Amino acid sequence: YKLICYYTSWSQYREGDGSCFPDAIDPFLCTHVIYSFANISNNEIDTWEWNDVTLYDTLNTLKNRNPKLKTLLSVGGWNFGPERFSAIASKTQSRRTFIKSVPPFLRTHGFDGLDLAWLYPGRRDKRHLTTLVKEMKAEFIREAQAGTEQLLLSAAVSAGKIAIDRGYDIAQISRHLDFISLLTYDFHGAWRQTVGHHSPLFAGNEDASSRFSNADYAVSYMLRLGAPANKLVMGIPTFGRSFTLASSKTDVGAPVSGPGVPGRFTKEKGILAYYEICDFLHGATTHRFRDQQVPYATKGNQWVAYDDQESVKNKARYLKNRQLAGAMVWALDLDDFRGTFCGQNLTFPLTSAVKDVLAEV
Ligand SMILES: *[C@@H]1O[C@H](CO)[C@@H](O[C@@H]2O[C@H](CO)[C@@H](O[C@H]3O[C@H](CO[C@@H]4O[C@H](CO)[C@@H](O)[C@H](O)[C@@H]4O)[C@@H](O)[C@H](O[C@H]4O[C@H](CO)[C@@H](O)[C@H](O)[C@@H]4O)[C@@H]3O)[C@H](O)[C@H]2NC(C)=O)[C@H](O)[C@H]1NC(C)=O
């Protein structure tokens, strides 16, 4: 089984213990570590942070301890305008320029592959995305003639039914990608004024209409559209989504007024690292959706939807049972990487729980 783990650049800037550098990463934890995110300049792949080539080097030295570890560099991301990706892929010339710049860059910095985080292709992009994947893979096939191990090509893809139908030709890109990471953790959000979980495993026979916003539906749909289970990797959260309640009600459907108050370390409204949630739990009331198989907690007027060791192990068994290639974790810097916030002296409790199940039969 594969255990794909993302590490984010901007996490080096968090204060105190929140600060996370590549060397905090256990070399034997994951099978693949992906550095997010690279940028695109003058239609060529490029660094993002001022110290990226230093962090690239730090990350890739982990391979000195675990020779089987593979690393990839992810291009795109949220702070990367989808339109920008759009313009690059639409024209044969700018596309070909981008494709040619990738191998040397990866070879120079020591990466084993490229991860595409085009978020998200619209209706007009579908055909170009296919073109980008095909041609990028062909270039990787060509570059390997030089005697070096062929570069890997992966992509992070929406788990939303409508997003999938709109921007992806799953049957086509599946044959060219080494693995597809399903972003099965964006099923709810603070864009809608009600309380709900962003990463439920199952539908839940209650207040419905979605019936598509759960990991089980997403996996099934991808398999039906033509993607081989052996290339699918299910995404597992290491963060939680928070809400500010508009009333004293805490159960399903509870009125929301906006995002939750920022965490001391992550400083972003609407989300909390798992290590911040461990602290948040002291004095909070914990609950669990029986049907969806995921937990949530409340304290004062704060409502948090998150994943714990049990829900994550649960998700891992589910993907083993559907015979998928593995799991993807977003992100290592959001898990209790120091291992000093969550109680049981253990580094990366969430990611380790996934690994244990995967190492199981
Ligand atoms: C990721 O990679 C992207 C893509 O390269 C970077 O984004 C580009 O970065 C530069 C610097 O941040 C920006 O450059 C240029 O801005 C001036 C022109 O911008 C115009 O802005 C007006 C808006 O009022 C708009 O009407 C025009 O359409 C145009 O966009 C330009 O004059 C600036 O300067 C130069 O001027 C002369 C050469 O003409 C030279 O003497 C100077 O030294 C200098 O080179 C500058 O070049 C650009 O606006 C920005 N655009 C995009 C696509 O975002 C990112 O910085 C990268 N991200 C990270 C984190 O690095």
From Swiss-Prot:
Chitin binds at E49, W50, G76, G77, W78, N79, Y120, L183, T184, Y185, D186, R241, W330. Disulfide bonds join C5-C30, C278-C342. Pfam families: Glyco_hydro_18. GO terms for biological process: activation of NF-kappaB-inducing kinase activity; apoptotic process; carbohydrate metabolic process; cellular response to tumor necrosis factor; chitin catabolic process; inflammatory response; lung development; positive regulation of angiogenesis. Detected in mammary gland. GO terms for cellular component: cytoplasm; endoplasmic reticulum; extracellular space; perinuclear region of cytoplasm. Residues 302-316 are annotated as: Important for AKT1 activation and IL8 production. Glycans are attached at N39, N345. The keyword rRNA-binding does not apply. Residues 1-361 form the GH18 domain. Keywords: Antimicrobial, Apoptosis, Cytoplasm, Disulfide bond, Endoplasmic reticulum, Glycoprotein, Inflammatory response, Lectin, Secreted. It is found in: Secreted, Extracellular space; Cytoplasm; Cytoplasm, Perinuclear region; Endoplasmic reticulum. The keyword Endoplasmic reticulum applies. GO terms for molecular function: carbohydrate binding; chitin binding. Monomer. Carbohydrate-binding lectin with a preference for chitin. Has no chitinase activity. May play a role in tissue remodeling and in the capacity of cells to respond to and cope with changes in their environment. Plays a role in T-helper cell type 2 (Th2) inflammatory response and IL-13-induced inflammation, regulating allergen sensitization, inflammatory cell apoptosis, dendritic cell accumulation and M2 macrophage differentiation. Facilitates invasion of pathogenic enteric bacteria into colonic mucosa and lymphoid organs. Belongs to the glycosyl hydrolase 18 family. This is Chitinase-3-like protein 1. It comes from Ovis aries (Sheep).
